[PDB]
Design an enzyme around this catalytic site. Structure first.
Site, PDB file in Angstrom:
ATOM      1  N   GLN A  39       0.848  -1.196   0.000  1.00 56.99           N
ATOM      2  CA  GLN A  39       0.000   0.000   0.000  1.00 56.99           C
ATOM      3  C   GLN A  39       0.883   1.245   0.000  1.00 56.99           C
ATOM      4  OE1 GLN A  39      -3.508   0.091  -0.054  1.00 56.99           O
ATOM      5  NE2 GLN A  39      -3.401  -2.111  -0.365  1.00 56.99           N
ATOM      6  N   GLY A  72      -7.679  -1.282  -1.507  1.00 57.48           N
ATOM      7  CA  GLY A  72      -7.588   0.161  -1.617  1.00 57.48           C
ATOM      8  C   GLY A  72      -7.475   0.982  -0.351  1.00 57.48           C
ATOM      9  N   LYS A 169       0.068   0.341 -14.421  1.00 56.60           N
ATOM     10  CA  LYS A 169       0.971  -0.660 -13.883  1.00 56.60           C
ATOM     11  C   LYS A 169       1.808  -1.142 -15.070  1.00 56.60           C
ATOM     12  CE  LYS A 169       0.015  -5.102 -11.655  1.00 56.60           C
ATOM     13  NZ  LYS A 169       0.004  -4.624 -10.260  1.00 56.60           N
ATOM     14  N   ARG A 171       5.128  -3.789 -16.008  1.00 60.26           N
ATOM     15  CA  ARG A 171       6.221  -4.716 -15.776  1.00 60.26           C
ATOM     16  C   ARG A 171       6.434  -5.471 -17.106  1.00 60.26           C
ATOM     17  NH1 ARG A 171       6.065 -10.658 -14.473  1.00 60.26           N
ATOM     18  NH2 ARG A 171       7.021 -10.518 -16.552  1.00 60.26           N
ATOM     19  N   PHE A 174       9.191 -11.373 -19.317  1.00 61.73           N
ATOM     20  CA  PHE A 174      10.574 -11.832 -19.367  1.00 61.73           C
ATOM     21  C   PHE A 174      11.031 -12.280 -20.745  1.00 61.73           C
ATOM     22  CE2 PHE A 174       9.188 -12.256 -14.918  1.00 61.73           C
ATOM     23  CZ  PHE A 174       9.679 -10.986 -14.607  1.00 61.73           C
ATOM     24  N   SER A 199      11.425  -6.831  -7.657  1.00 64.40           N
ATOM     25  CA  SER A 199      10.378  -6.468  -8.591  1.00 64.40           C
ATOM     26  C   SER A 199      10.933  -5.658  -9.780  1.00 64.40           C
ATOM     27  CB  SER A 199       9.308  -5.659  -7.851  1.00 64.40           C
ATOM     28  OG  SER A 199       8.235  -5.315  -8.716  1.00 64.40           O
ATOM     29  N   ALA A 200      10.452  -5.960 -10.987  1.00 61.82           N
ATOM     30  CA  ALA A 200      10.878  -5.231 -12.190  1.00 61.82           C
ATOM     31  C   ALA A 200       9.760  -4.291 -12.620  1.00 61.82           C
ATOM     32  CB  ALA A 200      11.194  -6.214 -13.314  1.00 61.82           C
TER      33      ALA A 200
HETATM   34  N1  LIG Z   1     -11.005  -6.170 -15.274  1.00 57.53           N
HETATM   35  C1  LIG Z   1     -10.827  -5.842 -13.982  1.00 57.53           C
HETATM   36  N2  LIG Z   1     -11.548  -4.853 -13.485  1.00 57.53           N
HETATM   37  C2  LIG Z   1     -11.398  -4.483 -12.265  1.00 57.53           C
HETATM   38  N3  LIG Z   1     -10.577  -4.995 -11.399  1.00 57.53           N
HETATM   39  C3  LIG Z   1      -9.844  -5.998 -11.881  1.00 57.53           C
HETATM   40  C4  LIG Z   1      -9.903  -6.477 -13.143  1.00 57.53           C
HETATM   41  N4  LIG Z   1      -8.995  -7.546 -13.320  1.00 57.53           N
HETATM   42  C5  LIG Z   1      -8.385  -7.661 -12.044  1.00 57.53           C
HETATM   43  N5  LIG Z   1      -8.895  -6.720 -11.171  1.00 57.53           N
HETATM   44  C6  LIG Z   1      -8.504  -6.445  -9.806  1.00 57.53           C
HETATM   45  O1  LIG Z   1      -7.155  -5.911  -9.865  1.00 57.53           O
HETATM   46  C7  LIG Z   1      -6.788  -6.106  -8.488  1.00 57.53           C
HETATM   47  C8  LIG Z   1      -5.281  -6.249  -8.386  1.00 57.53           C
HETATM   48  S1  LIG Z   1      -4.656  -5.917  -6.716  1.00 57.53           S
HETATM   49  C9  LIG Z   1      -4.954  -4.179  -6.679  1.00 57.53           C
HETATM   50  C10 LIG Z   1      -4.594  -3.551  -5.340  1.00 57.53           C
HETATM   51  C11 LIG Z   1      -5.194  -2.161  -5.125  1.00 57.53           C
HETATM   52  N6  LIG Z   1      -4.781  -1.259  -6.199  1.00 57.53           N
HETATM   53  C12 LIG Z   1      -4.773  -1.616  -3.766  1.00 57.53           C
HETATM   54  O2  LIG Z   1      -4.579  -0.386  -3.695  1.00 57.53           O
HETATM   55  O3  LIG Z   1      -4.936  -2.341  -2.763  1.00 57.53           O
HETATM   56  C13 LIG Z   1      -7.576  -7.244  -7.913  1.00 57.53           C
HETATM   57  O4  LIG Z   1      -8.340  -6.723  -6.764  1.00 57.53           O
HETATM   58  C14 LIG Z   1      -8.450  -7.666  -8.997  1.00 57.53           C
HETATM   59  O5  LIG Z   1      -9.823  -8.029  -8.640  1.00 57.53           O
HETATM   60  C1  LIG Z   2      12.348 -10.009 -11.360  1.00 63.17           C
HETATM   61  N1  LIG Z   2      12.180 -11.406 -11.698  1.00 63.17           N
HETATM   62  C2  LIG Z   2      11.537 -12.260 -10.982  1.00 63.17           C
HETATM   63  N2  LIG Z   2      11.471 -13.511 -11.522  1.00 63.17           N
HETATM   64  C3  LIG Z   2      10.720 -14.667 -11.005  1.00 63.17           C
HETATM   65  O1  LIG Z   2       9.472 -14.146 -10.509  1.00 63.17           O
HETATM   66  C4  LIG Z   2       9.210 -14.824  -9.280  1.00 63.17           C
HETATM   67  C5  LIG Z   2       8.316 -13.972  -8.379  1.00 63.17           C
HETATM   68  O2  LIG Z   2       8.834 -12.658  -8.112  1.00 63.17           O
HETATM   69  C6  LIG Z   2      10.576 -15.037  -8.661  1.00 63.17           C
HETATM   70  O3  LIG Z   2      10.548 -16.125  -7.718  1.00 63.17           O
HETATM   71  C7  LIG Z   2      11.435 -15.394  -9.860  1.00 63.17           C
HETATM   72  O4  LIG Z   2      11.401 -16.794 -10.164  1.00 63.17           O
HETATM   73  C8  LIG Z   2      12.165 -13.434 -12.708  1.00 63.17           C
HETATM   74  N3  LIG Z   2      12.381 -14.437 -13.597  1.00 63.17           N
HETATM   75  C9  LIG Z   2      13.095 -14.045 -14.662  1.00 63.17           C
HETATM   76  N4  LIG Z   2      13.390 -14.906 -15.637  1.00 63.17           N
HETATM   77  N5  LIG Z   2      13.546 -12.747 -14.806  1.00 63.17           N
HETATM   78  C10 LIG Z   2      13.335 -11.718 -13.918  1.00 63.17           C
HETATM   79  O5  LIG Z   2      13.773 -10.599 -14.146  1.00 63.17           O
HETATM   80  C11 LIG Z   2      12.588 -12.134 -12.799  1.00 63.17           C
END
Ligand SMILES: Nc1ncnc2c1ncn2[C@@H]1O[C@H](CSCC[C@H](N)C(=O)O)[C@@H](O)[C@H]1O
Ligand SMILES: C[n+]1cn([C@@H]2O[C@H](CO)[C@@H](O)[C@H]2O)c2nc(N)[nH]c(=O)c21
Ligand SMILES: Nc1ncnc2c1ncn2[C@@H]1O[C@H](CSCC[C@H](N)C(=O)O)[C@@H](O)[C@H]1O
Ligand SMILES: C[n+]1cn([C@@H]2O[C@H](CO)[C@@H](O)[C@H]2O)c2nc(N)[nH]c(=O)c21
Lengths: 291, 291
Positions: A39, A72, A169, A171, A174, A199-200
């Site tokens: 959060q 949220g 969001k 990311r 891979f 996290s990436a």
């Molecule tokens: N099409 C969609 N519409 C709305 N919510 C969706 C969705 N697909 C996934 N979600 C929601 O995306 C969420 C990801 S977790 C989000 C955490 C939230 N932003 C926080 O502040 O706590 C999940 O609750 C999931 O139900």
């Molecule tokens: C940033 N990262 C996480 N995991 C994978 O995501 C799981 C949950 O976080 C990790 O356990 C790891 O296996 C990745 N795998 C690959 N190949 N490359 C990445 O950059 C990577």
């Protein structure tokens, strides 16, 4: 100890000046050190984003459509903040899951229990009209196929909703799990302090000018770059102790957090940036129940 | 007679300086005055487009992927032209219908009898790689639903094929037949001489720089504008006789054609632009069997 003197933190992806070969073993390493770190991560990134829009004069009067908003809990702090500053905003929080009850009873915030789809987006667009829309997306289905699916929906949120700005969001999938090249909206790749250890993930911040929408292709080579730069930041950078950073906590993430928080607007006047930031951070930690 | 003195013709949509309320009765009016007017229309627009790319140095060595190419009689002239000038290009003409036999037997032109779909685009992309691709689209399914469908496919041609430039068929749907707003690629809205009398069609010309793709939204209001500006051009402008245009034919379309042809590159050296254009036009008319 891993000490260092840093001028400023990497605020955007493009700033990262080094890379490392990804070590698959890092996935087994402890992802989180702080309670409610998730959060917090979201609250800083979203306070940063929204303060900017305020700065550009496009926040006041908009309706913030947050998709993937539940639970949220942190959105309550975000709402109170701008609400106490006097900005006029309506919050529409949509998710299929249930929202933290602290969000109930606020005339300015509407909660919707609905998973959104293209058809639904069109209906909320017709119902919000003619208000200005600010979009924040945090939906989560994962497989590369799941990702592409999420990114594809996010692009539809923008085309249909037609917001003045967006936070999405982001990311990259891979490289070793590539499926196909795809397009994401153009925006600043905002780095996130307190993201999980390896996290990436980052947040794409975009402001829409005119009636254009610019996209950018993402190839496997880009996926290799993302992996190496984000791996370098997580393994090395985030583990730095900024000794020249005079603050109660000197770890990289607090240094990074400091720079994000120094851009937030407050009511109280402080003699220094350090005093405003300390104030904002204390307030945030107390609200989230983080020691 | 409807005579006038004009400096230059409207080359792009944005240039049109006036509008008229669309008269539904105009649809009953004679759509074409010249035999093979359609191929002529396509041949000028495509010679214009390709000469520009030549001008920017991105033609030589590319593979032109033309979708919606059959019969394609005029493509033979286009091919010979650049082929005789010495530009090295490969032509890949794909359509489900059959191509004019004059296109057969040329090692540099490949004909494919296939209606393209997203999956197919991916295969030709993998098979053309690593050549630079130039895309030309003239596919036709019509209903607004048919249009959106065609425009949607054209955007996929670009995302998958990833060309260095593109020429796309572009006719906005009618306002009174609106369904939904949509995005088309950013580009110059090239006006077409010899288009059918009341045609609202044009060609979108785009050159892709970097790894970005910029789009532009099209709303019903835009559809109203398109209708009025194109109606004004067709009813009034195209019916003008440019008396200050010293040329064998003074009608607006030949004046418009003149400006397009003066940008084409030739082998022969001419003392004047008028001499090069007369030459190119004669050559074109003789090839198409137009009196
Ligand atoms: N099409 C969609 N519409 C709305 N919510 C969706 C969705 N697909 C996934 N979600 C929601 O995306 C969420 C990801 S977790 C989000 C955490 C939230 N932003 C926080 O502040 O706590 C999940 O609750 C999931 O139900
Ligand atoms: C940033 N990262 C996480 N995991 C994978 O995501 C799981 C949950 O976080 C990790 O356990 C790891 O296996 C990745 N795998 C690959 N190949 N490359 C990445 O950059 C990577
Ligand atoms: N998905 C698709 N792939 C390829 N061709 C398509 C198509 N959908 C429609 N077409 C073709 O688009 C064409 C429109 S007419 C095109 C005329 C051609 N450019 C000329 O120079 O003569 C039709 O021949 C039709 O078969
Ligand atoms: C440019 N044009 C042609 N038609 C219609 O398309 C048919 C084939 O060319 C015409 O017969 C006419 O009915 C148009 N109808 C509307 N509403 N608006 C237009 O701008 C228009």
């Amino acid at each position: 100890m891993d000490v260092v003197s840093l001028d400023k933190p990497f605020m955007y992806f493009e700033e990262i000046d080094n890379e490392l070969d990804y070590e698959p073993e890092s996935a087994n390493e402890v992802a989180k050190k702080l309670p409610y770190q998730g959060q917090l991560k979201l609250l800083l990134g979203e306070l940063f984003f929204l303060s900017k829009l305020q700065r550009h004069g496009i926040l006041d009067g908009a309706t913030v459509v947050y998709i993937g908003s539940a639970p949220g809990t942190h959105i309550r702090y975000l709402r109170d903040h701008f609400y106490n500053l006097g900005v006029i905003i309506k919050w529409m929080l949509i998710d299929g899951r249930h929202h933290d009850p602290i969000l109930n009873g606020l005339r300015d915030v509407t909660l919707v229990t609905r998973f959104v789809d293209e058809e639904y987006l069109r209906s909320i667009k017709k119902q919000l009209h003619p208000s200005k829309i600010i979009l924040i997306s945090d939906v989560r289905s994962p497989s590369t196929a799941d990702l592409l699916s999420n990114y594809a929906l996010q692009n539809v949120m923008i085309s249909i909703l037609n917001p003045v700005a967006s936070s999405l969001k982001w990311r990259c999938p891979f490289p070793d799990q590539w499926i196909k090249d795809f397009y994401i909206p153009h925006g600043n790749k905002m780095l996130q302090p307190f993201a999980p250890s390896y996290s990436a993930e980052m947040r794409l911040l975009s402001i829409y000018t005119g009636e254009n929408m610019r996209l950018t292709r993402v190839t496997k080579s880009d996926a290799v770059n993302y992996q190496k730069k984000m791996y370098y930041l997580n393994k090395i950078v985030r583990n730095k102790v900024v000794v020249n950073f005079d603050y109660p906590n000197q770890e990289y993430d607090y240094f990074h957090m400091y720079f994000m928080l120094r851009t937030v607007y407050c009511n109280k006047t402080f003699p220094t940036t350090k005093a405003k930031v300390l104030f904002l951070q204390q307030s945030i930690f107390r609200f989230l129940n983080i020691p």
